[PDB]
Design a protein around this ligand. Structure first.
Ligand SMILES: CN(C)C(=O)[C@@H]([C@H]1CC[C@H](c2ccc3ncnn3c2)CC1)[C@H](N)C(=O)N1CCC(F)(F)C1
Ligand SMILES: CN(C)C(=O)[C@@H]([C@H]1CC[C@H](c2ccc3ncnn3c2)CC1)[C@H](N)C(=O)N1CCC(F)(F)C1
Ligand SMILES: *[C@@H]1O[C@H](CO)[C@@H](O[C@@H]2O[C@H](CO)[C@@H](O)[C@H](O)[C@H]2NC(C)=O)[C@H](O)[C@H]1NC(C)=O
Ligand SMILES: *[C@@H]1O[C@H](CO)[C@@H](O[C@@H]2O[C@H](CO)[C@@H](O)[C@H](O)[C@H]2NC(C)=O)[C@H](O)[C@H]1NC(C)=O
Ligand SMILES: *[C@@H]1O[C@H](CO)[C@@H](O[C@@H]2O[C@H](CO)[C@@H](O)[C@H](O)[C@H]2NC(C)=O)[C@H](O)[C@H]1NC(C)=O
Ligand SMILES: *[C@@H]1O[C@H](CO)[C@@H](O[C@@H]2O[C@H](CO)[C@@H](O)[C@H](O)[C@H]2NC(C)=O)[C@H](O)[C@H]1NC(C)=O
Ligand SMILES: *[C@@H]1O[C@H](CO)[C@@H](O[C@@H]2O[C@H](CO)[C@@H](O)[C@H](O)[C@H]2NC(C)=O)[C@H](O)[C@H]1NC(C)=O
Ligand SMILES: *[C@@H]1O[C@H](CO)[C@@H](O[C@H]2O[C@H](CO)[C@@H](O)[C@H](O)[C@H]2NC(C)=O)[C@H](O)[C@H]1NC(C)=O
Ligand SMILES: *[C@@H]1O[C@H](CO)[C@@H](O[C@H]2O[C@H](CO)[C@@H](O)[C@H](O)[C@H]2NC(C)=O)[C@H](O)[C@H]1NC(C)=O
Ligand SMILES: *[C@H]1O[C@H](CO)[C@@H](O[C@@H]2O[C@H](CO)[C@@H](O)[C@H](O)[C@H]2NC(C)=O)[C@H](O)[C@H]1NC(C)=O
Ligand SMILES: *[C@H]1O[C@H](CO)[C@@H](O[C@@H]2O[C@H](CO)[C@@H](O)[C@H](O)[C@H]2NC(C)=O)[C@H](O)[C@H]1NC(C)=O
Ligand SMILES: *[C@@H]1O[C@H](CO)[C@@H](O)[C@H](O)[C@H]1NC(C)=O
Ligand SMILES: *[C@@H]1O[C@H](CO)[C@@H](O)[C@H](O)[C@H]1NC(C)=O
Ligand SMILES: *[C@@H]1O[C@H](CO)[C@@H](O)[C@H](O)[C@H]1NC(C)=O
Ligand SMILES: *[C@@H]1O[C@H](CO)[C@@H](O)[C@H](O)[C@H]1NC(C)=O
Ligand SMILES: *[C@@H]1O[C@H](CO)[C@@H](O)[C@H](O)[C@H]1NC(C)=O
Ligand SMILES: *[C@@H]1O[C@H](CO)[C@@H](O)[C@H](O)[C@H]1NC(C)=O
Ligand code: NA
Lengths: 728, 728
C-alpha cells in the first residue's frame, strides 16, 4: 500500500538528505551553522556556544549570500549581491563586521563587483581582486594597497584565473596563494591577448529588445593558449608612498621552450614555495622548489631541487600532476604518483633527491593524501575488499610502512563503504563522512587513539520517512573482459523479480578517469525510474575509467571515442543476455561527456539500443577546450593526431541513427560545451534525412540547473523514456 | 486501387508542375530556355531560332547561374559564383560576352563580389554596386566611372538597400533607377550609422572551429531607423567631367519634420521623375514630381505638382503607397487608391491638380495596373463573380470609361479563375498565366484584336499522371458573420463523405492584407494530408485580410493579435457546426505571422484545438522590424500604443498552453523573425512548467528552404500531426 519514489519527489526534494558541514577553526574547535546561527563546538566534549546571532544583521538591508570569519575570529566577511559567472567564478559585494566592537566597518570598504576575496591564513589580513587587479588590506578598516596595475577585462588576469584555467586546471577562480603565516602573497597572472573568443547569444528577460552577444576568451583544441607568469609579494613591507614590488619566479627552461601551463602551487614553509609546470603536450611536468633569500629579497629555485614527472603511456596525473604534501620543516614531501605497475601510490621525496620511495603499493589506488603528522600520513584509498568503487580512510606509520591501519573500514561495513574526511588544524581530530551504500553518516573522531567520539548526524529522520516508500536497491558487481574485471552497478526496482523481463536504461558518463559504478547512496532521476517505472538503470566503468590503474585508464590515450564507447555497447550486450532484461527495451542516456558517448553509441550500428538521450554532448573534439582535449588527444595537426580528431566525431555517424529514437538536448548559453556541438549534430542528422527529437533551453548553461529548466528537462526526458518503453 | 498523393511525392516532387517563363526582348520577340539552350520566339507566328546554343559556355570554367541580354541585343551579362544573402540580395561574379564578336570581354571586368548590376533600359550602358558604391560603364570593355565614395559596409549604402528597405519597402536589393532613355541615373543612399544590430551565430560546415557571429543593422519596433537621401547623376556627362555631380533631391518639409522613408521612385519622362515619401507614422505620404532644369542642371519639384495621400482608418497602401503609371507625355498618371468606400480603385491624376478621377469603382478591388497604351489601360482585379480570391485581366478604354472588357474571364471559366499577365515591350502581345483552380495554363495573345495566338503550355503531361492518383478536392466558399462575407477554402480528402467526421487542420497565416482562400491550384503538404491521411485542411480570411476593402483590412489597425486571432478560432467553431468534422481532432498550424496566430490561438484557452505547430513565429511585436510592425501597431511608447504592444505577446499566454500539444520550430539563422522570438516562447513555457515539442534547424533562415531541412521539417510535422490525430 506504500507509495513509490516519484518524479515529483525527485524534483521537489521531498526526501532530503541531512548533512553536517562544519568548518575547523583550530585544532580543537569548529564552526557549525544551526538555526541560521553560527555555533562554535569543542571537539573533545561536544559542548558548544553561540558564536554569531542569526539576528545580528536583521537590519543589514542586504540578503547575505555567505560569510567568512577571519582566522583569528575577530572579523566576519559578509557576502551579498552574488552574481554567478562560470563553474566557480562570481562577483559580489562585501562588508566586514567587527566582532569585538560588535560593529560594521564603514571606512575603506571592499569595492562592489569584487571578483575574489580571501583572509590571510593567520590573523586578519585581506587580499581581494577587483577589475582584474590585486589589492591587500592589512587591517579591515585601513586603506588597501594596490599590488597590480595591469588588470584588463578579458585580457590580463591578476590573482584570478581565465575561463580555461578556472574550469580545467585549478577548479577555482582564485589564483592567489598566501604563505603559511600571511607574510607573502603569491599570485599568477594570465594573458589571454591572443586567445580567440567563443561568442553566443543571451536572450535575457523578454523585455530585452536586442539579444546580447556574450564573448569569452576560450581556447579550443589547437588554438592559441593564454600565457602565464608567477609572482610573489611581501605584504609586510608595503608602502603607501611606493608601489608594491612583486618578485617574479620564471618557469624552467625545459618549459619555456614552448607552450606550457602552471598546474600547481603549494607552499612548503614560511620561506619556501613549490610550483609544478606542465608542457602543452601533457606527458611531462616539472616541479620547482624555491626559497626566499633575505639578502637579495629574491626567490631562488635550485636546479638540484627540481623534480620531473613524466608518463610514457598517457598524460601526467589523473586530471593534472598531484599536489605535494610537505613535512613541517619542508625538507621532504609526499606525493601520489603512478608507480611502475601503473597504480597511483604515495611516494616519499627528499627535496634535493631525484629518487622517491613508494610507501604504499598494491593493485588498488590512493585517492588522496588527507593529513600529515610526524608519526602518520592519513589517506583515502579503494583498497578495502578490492572494491575500486569503495573509499576508506587509512593511516600509515612513517617509521614503518608495513604498519597500515584502516580507520573506517570496520565502523559499519554494511552501511558505510565510501568515506570522505575532514581533519582539524593539526590533525588532532577528524570528521568522517560516510556517503554509502546506506544513508549518509557523519561522525567525529580523535587521532591519538582513533576513538569514535560521537555521531554528528545519522539521517535517522530520512530513514524513518523512507520506510513508507518502495525504494529500489543497488547491485554493485563486475563482469570480466579479456582477463580484466570491469565494474557496473544496477539500480533495481522494488520487489525485483529475476524471472521477469525489465526494460533497461544505461546511464553513462565514461569520460577519462570517470567512475559511475560505486557504493554511493543517491536519490536522483534513476531512483524514480526504478521505483515508479520499474526500469533497471545501469552504469558501467570500462576502459578509460579511473581508480583502477593506468592500464585501464590510459587505454584511450589519444583515442577518445573508441574503447570507452565500445565497452558500453559490450556491457549492454551482456546485460541484454541476462534473464531479467528485455532485450527489446534497452536505452542509453548521458550528459556532457556522457552525451558524447551516448551519441557515438547510438550512431555505432550496434543494434542493441532502441533509443537514447544526449544532453549537452561534445560532438567533435576540435570544439572543446585545449587543456582538457589535448591532454587526451594531443594536437589536431597532421603531424600529430588530426586523423583521429576527424574520425571520432558524432557527425560522421549520422546515417546509423536511422534505426534508433534519439532526443538531443542543449542549453543555448552553454559556455562549457558550446551549443555549437549540438547544432552540428542536428544539421548532420538533417543532412542524411534522419528524424529525431530535440529541445533547446533558452539561456541555460551546461548545468541546465535553474529550478524551472531542471524540472522541465527531467519531465521531458521521462515522457520520452516511458514512450520508448511503452510505459503508461 | 489508385495510389494517393504521398509525403514522398511532395518532398520528392514526383508530380512536376510545368510552366512557361519567357523574357520579352522587344515588342514581338521573347527568349525561352529549352533543352538548356536559349531560344528566341516570334510572338506573331510561334516560330523560333537558337539564340544561344547550350554548349556556348561548356568551357567557361564556371557554372552560369543566370544571364541578361542588353536591351540592344549587342551583349550578354553572365552571372556566376552566386552567393545568396537575404530575400532578394546576393553577391556574384560577372563576365560580359560580346554577341557580335562572339568573344568574352576580358578587360575592365566587373569586380568579383558585385552587389548589383543592371543594364541601362536602352543601349548597353551598365551600372553596378561594389563595396557599397555605384559605378557606371558606358561601354562593356572600357573603364567604369565611380559615382560615390561614401560606401561603407553595414553603414552607408549607395544604390542598394539595407536590410529593412530591402525586405519591407522595395522588395529588392537595388536602389538605383535609370531614366527611360538612360541619360540619368537616380539612386538612394541609406545611412544605418545608428541602427542597432541583431547578432546571432552561424555555425557553417563542421570544419569551422569557432562559430561566426552574424551582425546586421536591423531596426526593431521603436528603434533608431536608417535615414535616406536621393540623388540623380547625368551619365552622359561622365566622359566629359572628371567627377560628375550627383544632384540631390530633398524630401518635402512635411517629411523633414521627423523620421520618414523613401517608398517609391518612378520616372515619368526623360526629364521628370516622381518620388513618394512616407512618414514614420505611416498614414501620411507625399509624392513629389521633379523636372530637370537645363539651365542650372538642378532638379525642381513644384509644390503645385505635389500629391498627398493619407489614411484615416489605417495605414497608406496595401503594404506601401501604390506606384504611379504615367502617360507618355508625363502630364498625367493613374494610381490605385482607396476610394471613399474603402475599395482600391484606379484614380486618374493630372500632375498639377490635386483632385483625381476614379475610373473604376465597385465592391471589389483593383490588384494592379499591368500596362498603359495611348488608348487603353490594362489591369488585374477580383471583380469577376464577386470572388475576392479570383484574379482576371481587364481592359478599359481611356476615351470611354464605360467601356471595360474582361480579357480572361470567359476563356475557360471552369479551369481558370486566377490570372497574371506579361505584356511585350510596347504591349503588342501578352502572355496570360492561369494558375487555378485547374492545372496552370499558359497562353499567348495579340493585343491588336485580343485574339488567342496559341497555347504555350497546358500541363497535359501532369494531367495524365494525376489520373492515376486519388487527388483531394478543393472547396472555396464563404460564411456570413455580422452580415459580412468571410471566405474560406477546404482541401477535402478523396471520396469525401459529409456523413463522416474528419479530423481538421486549420492552415493559418492571417497577417494584414493576407489571403489564404483563393482559386490557385497547389500541390503541397495539405495535398498529401488530405489525399493520404484523409485530413481536412482549411484556411479562413477574417478581419485584417485583404482585397476586400478597408473595412475588413483596417479592422486590426493598431490591434494585431486580436480580431485576426479570434476570427480564426470562430472559423474552427463554424467548421465544427458543418457536421463533417470531428471536434476531438481539430489542429492548427502556421508559419511566420501564421506561427504567431497559431501560438496566440493555442494560448487563448478556447478549448477548440487539440494541438498546433508554430514555425518561425513572431512572439512579441517589439522584436520585429520598425517599418512593418509600426505600420500596423504604431510606436511602442506610453504616449502611443505600448500597452497593446505589451498585451499582444505570445509569452503572456504561456499558462494556457497546458491545455494543448504544441510543437515549436525555428531556424537558428533566421535574419527576419529572429530565433530570439521562439527562444522567448520556450523560456516562458519552461517558466510555467508546460511540456511541449521543439525543433531548431541549424543555419536555416525564415524559409527553412534548403532541400534537406525542407524534407526534414515536413516529415517531422507529419509525425506530430498523425500522432495528435491518432493516425497510423
Ligand atoms: C566531469 N567534469 C565535471 C569535468 O570533466 C570537467 C572538469 C572537472 C574538474 C577536473 C579537474 C581539474 C583539476 C584537478 N585537480 C584534481 N582534480 N582535478 C579535477 C577537470 C575536468 C570538464 N571540464 C567538463 O566540463 N567537460 C564537459 C565536456 C567534457 F565532458 F569533455 C569535459
Ligand atoms: C507575407 N510576407 C512574405 C511578408 O509579410 C513579408 C513582406 C513581403 C513583402 C511585402 C511588400 C513590400 C512592398 C510592396 N510593394 C508592393 N507589394 N509589396 C509587398 C511586405 C511584407 C514580411 N516582411 C515578413 O517576412 N514577415 C514575417 C513576420 C511577419 F509575418 F510579421 C511579416
Ligand atoms: C612569517 O614568516 C616570515 C619569514 O620567516 C617572518 O619574517 C621574518 O621575521 C624575522 C624575525 O622577525 C626577520 O628577521 C626576517 O627579516 C623576516 N623575513 C621576512 C622575509 O619578512 C615573519 O615574522 C612571520 N610572521 C609571523 C606572523 O609569524
Ligand atoms: C520566323 O519565321 C519568319 C518567316 O515565317 C522569319 O521571317 C524572316 O524575317 C526577316 C526579317 O527579320 C526577313 O528578312 C526574312 O525574309 C523572313 N523570312 C521569311 C521566310 O519570311 C523570321 O525571321 C523567323 N523568326 C525566328 C525567330 O525564327
Ligand atoms: C551617416 O549618419 C551619421 C549620423 O548618424 C553621420 O555621422 C556624423 O557625421 C558628422 C559630420 O561629419 C560628425 O560630426 C558626427 O560625429 C557623426 N555622428 C556619428 C554618430 O557618427 C554620417 O556622416 C552620415 N554619413 C553620410 C555619408 O551621410
Ligand atoms: C568626387 O566628388 C565628391 C563630391 O564632392 C567627392 O566627395 C567628397 O570628398 C571629400 C574629400 O574626399 C569629402 O570631404 C566630402 O565629404 C565628400 N562628399 C561626398 C558627397 O561624398 C569625391 O571625393 C570626389 N572624387 C574625386 C576622385 O575627386
Ligand atoms: C535622352 O533624354 C535626354 C534628356 O531629354 C536627352 O538629352 C538632352 O538632349 C537635348 C537635345 O535633344 C539637349 O538639348 C539637352 O542638353 C540634353 N539634356 C541633357 C540633360 O543631357 C538625350 O539626348 C536623350 N537620349 C536619346 C538617345 O535620345
Ligand atoms: C566547552 O566546555 C569547556 C569546559 O568543559 C569550556 O571551558 C573551557 O574554556 C573556557 C573559556 O574558553 C574556560 O572558562 C574553561 O576553564 C575551559 N575549560 C577547561 C577544562 O580548561 C569551553 O569554553 C567550552 N567550549 C565552547 C565552544 O563552549
Ligand atoms: C600580453 O600578451 C601580449 C601579446 O602576447 C603582449 O604584447 C606583445 O604582443 C603584442 C601582440 O598583440 C605585440 O604587438 C607587442 O609588441 C608585445 N609586447 C607588448 C608590450 O605589447 C603584452 O605585453 C602582454 N601583457 C602583459 C601585461 O604581459
Ligand atoms: C558599491 O556600490 C554600492 C551601492 O551603490 C555603494 O554604496 C552606496 O550606495 C548608495 C545607494 O545604495 C549610493 O547612494 C552611494 O553613492 C554608494 N556609496 C556610498 C559611499 O554610499 C558602495 O559605496 C560602492 N562601493 C565602492 C567601493 O564604491
Ligand atoms: C608523451 O606523448 C607524446 C605524444 O605521443 C610523445 O611525443 C612524441 O609523439 C610523436 C607523435 O606526436 C611520436 O612520433 C614520438 O615518438 C613521441 N616521442 C617523441 C620523443 O617525440 C612523448 O614522447 C611522450 N613523452 C614521454 C616522456 O613519454
Ligand atoms: C534564526 O532565524 C530563523 C529564521 O528562519 C529562525 O527559524 C531561528 O529560530 C532563529 N534562531 C533562533 C535561535 O531563534
Ligand atoms: C604606481 O604605478 C601606476 C601604474 O604604473 C602609476 O600610475 C602610479 O602613479 C604609480 N604610483 C606611484 C606612487 O609610483
Ligand atoms: C583483449 O580485450 C580488449 C578489450 O578489453 C580488446 O580490445 C583486445 O583486442 C583483446 N585482445 C588482446 C590481445 O588484448
Ligand atoms: C542542348 O543541350 C542539351 C544538354 O543540356 C542537349 O540535350 C540538347 O541536345 C542540346 N540542344 C539540341 C537542340 O540538341
Ligand atoms: C575574380 O576572382 C578570381 C579568383 O580569385 C580571379 O582569378 C579573377 O581574376 C577575379 N576577377 C576579377 C574581375 O577580379
Ligand atoms: C495618423 O495616425 C496617427 C496615429 O494614430 C493619428 O494620431 C493621426 O491623427 C493620423 N492622421 C490621419 C490623417 O489619420
Ligand atoms: Na562515541
Amino acid at each position: 500500500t506504500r507509495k513509490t519514489y516519484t518524479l515529483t519527489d525527485y524534483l521537489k526534494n521531498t526526501y532530503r538528505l541531512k548533512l553536517y558541514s562544519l568548518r575547523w577553526i583550530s585544532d580543537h574547535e569548529y564552526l557549525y551553522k544551526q538555526e541560521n546561527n553560527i555555533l562554535v563546538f569543542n571537539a573533545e566534549y561536544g559542548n558548544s556556544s553561540v558564536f554569531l546571532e542569526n539576528s545580528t544583521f536583521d537590519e543589514f538591508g542586504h540578503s547575505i549570500n555567505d560569510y567568512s570569519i577571519s582566522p583569528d575570529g575577530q572579523f566576519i566577511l559578509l557576502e551579498y549581491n552574488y552574481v554567478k559567472q562560470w563553474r566557480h567564478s562570481y562577483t559580489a559585494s562585501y562588508d566586514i563586521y567587527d566582532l569585538n566592537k560588535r560593529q560594521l566597518i564603514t571606512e575603506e570598504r571592499i569595492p562592489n563587483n569584487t571578483q575574489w576575496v580571501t583572509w590571510s591564513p593567520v590573523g586578519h589580513k585581506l587580499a581581494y581582486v577587483w577589475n582584474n587587479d590585486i589589492y591587500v588590506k592589512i587591517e579591515p578598516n585601513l586603506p588597501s594597497y594596490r599590488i597590480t596595475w595591469t588588470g584588463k577585462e578579458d585580457i590580463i588576469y591578476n590573482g584570478i584565473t581565465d575561463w580555461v584555467y578556472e574550469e580545467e586546471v585549478f577548479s577555482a577562480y582564485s589564483a592567489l596563494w598566501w604563505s603559511p603565516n600571511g607574510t607573502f602573497l603569491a599570485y599568477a597572472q594570465f594573458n589571454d591577448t591572443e586567445v580567440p573568443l567563443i561568442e553566443y547569444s543571451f536572450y535575457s528577460d523578454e523585455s530585452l529588445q536586442y539579444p546580447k552577444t556574450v564573448r569569452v576568451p576560450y581556447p579550443k583544441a589547437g588554438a592559441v593558449n593564454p600565457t602565464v607568469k608567477f609572482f610573489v609579494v611581501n605584504t609586510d613591507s608595503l608602502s603607501s608612498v611606493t608601489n608594491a614590488t612583486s618578485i617574479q619566479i620564471t618557469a624552467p627552461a625545459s618549459m619555456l621552450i614552448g607552450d606550457h601551463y602552471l598546474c600547481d602551487v603549494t607552499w612548503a614553509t614560511q620561506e619556501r614555495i613549490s610550483l609544478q609546470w606542465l608542457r602543452r603536450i601533457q606527458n611531462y611536468s616539472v616541479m620547482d622548489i624555491c626559497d626566499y633569500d633575505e639578502s637579495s629579497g629574491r626567490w631562488n629555485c635550485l636546479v638540484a631541487r627540481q623534480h620531473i614527472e613524466m608518463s610514457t603511456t598517457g598524460w601526467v596525473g589523473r586530471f593534472r600532476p598531484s599536489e605535494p604534501h610537505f613535512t613541517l620543516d619542508g625538507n621532504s614531501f609526499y606525493k601520489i604518483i603512478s608507480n611502475e605497475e601503473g597504480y597511483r601510490h604515495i611516494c616519499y621525496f627528499q627535496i634535493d633527491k631525484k629518487d622517491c620511495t613508494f610507501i604504499t603499493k598494491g593493485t588498488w589506488e590512493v585517492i588522496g593524501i588527507e593529513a600529515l603528522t610526524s608519526d602518520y600520513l592519513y589517506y583515502i584509498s579503494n583498497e578495502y575488499k578490492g572494491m575500486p568503487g569503495g573509499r576508506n580512510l587509512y593511516k600509515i606509520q612513517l617509521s614503518d610502512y608495513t604498519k597500515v591501519t584502516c580507520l573506517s573500514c570496520e565502523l559499519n561495513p554494511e552501511r558505510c563503504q565510501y568515506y570522505s574526511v575532514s581533519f582539524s588544524k593539526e590533525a588532532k581530530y577528524y570528521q568522517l563522512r560516510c556517503s554509502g551504500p546506506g544513508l549518509p553518516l557523519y561522525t567525529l573522531h580523535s587521532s591519538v587513539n582513533d576513538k569514535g567520539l560521537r555521531v554528528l548526524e545519522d539521517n535517522s529522520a530520512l530513514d524513518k520517512m523512507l520506510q513508507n516508500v518502495q525504494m529500489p536497491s543497488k547491485k554493485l558487481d563486475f563482469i570480466i573482459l579479456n582477463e580484466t574485471k570491469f565494474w557496473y552497478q544496477m539500480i533495481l526496482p522494488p520487489h525485483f523479480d529475476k524471472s521477469k523481463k525489465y526494460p533497461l536504461l544505461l546511464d553513462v558518463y565514461a569520460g577519462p578517469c570517470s567512475q559511475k559504478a560505486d557504493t554511493v547512496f543517491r536519490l536522483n532521476w534513476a531512483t524514480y525510474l526504478a521505483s515508479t517505472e520499474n526500469i533497471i538503470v545501469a552504469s558501467f566503468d570500462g576502459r578509460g575509467s579511473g581508480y583502477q590503474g593506468d592500464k585501464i585508464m590510459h587505454a584511450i590515450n589519444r583515442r577518445l571515442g573508441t574503447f570507452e564507447v565500445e565497452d558500453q555497447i559490450e556491457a549492454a550486450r551482456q546485460f541484454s543476455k541476462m534473464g531479467f532484461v528485455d532485450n527489446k527495451r534497452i536505452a542509453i542516456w548521458g550528459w556532457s561527456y556522457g552525451g558524447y558517448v551516448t551519441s557515438m553509441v547510438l550512431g555505432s550500428g550496434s543494434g542493441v539500443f532502441k533509443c537514447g538521450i544526449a544532453v549537452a554532448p561534445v560532438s567533435r573534439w576540435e570544439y572543446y577546450d585545449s587543456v582538457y582535449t589535448e591532454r587526451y588527444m594531443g594536437l589536431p595537426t597532421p603531424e600529430d593526431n588530426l586523423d583521429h580528431y576527424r574520425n571520432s566525431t558524432v557527425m560522421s555517424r549520422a546515417e546509423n541513427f536511422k534505426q534508433v529514437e534519439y532526443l538531443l538536448i542543449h542549453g543555448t548559453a552553454d559556455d562549457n560545451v558550446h551549443f555549437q556541438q549540438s547544432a552540428q549534430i542536428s544539421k548532420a542528422l538533417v543532412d542524411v534525412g534522419v528524424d529525431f527529437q530535440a529541445m533547446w533551453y533558452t539561456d541555460e548553461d551546461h548545468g541546465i540547473a535553474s529550478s524551472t529548466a531542471h524540472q522541465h528537462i527531467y519531465t521531458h526526458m521521462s515522457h520520452f523514456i516511458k514512450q520508448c518503453f511503452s510505459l503508461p
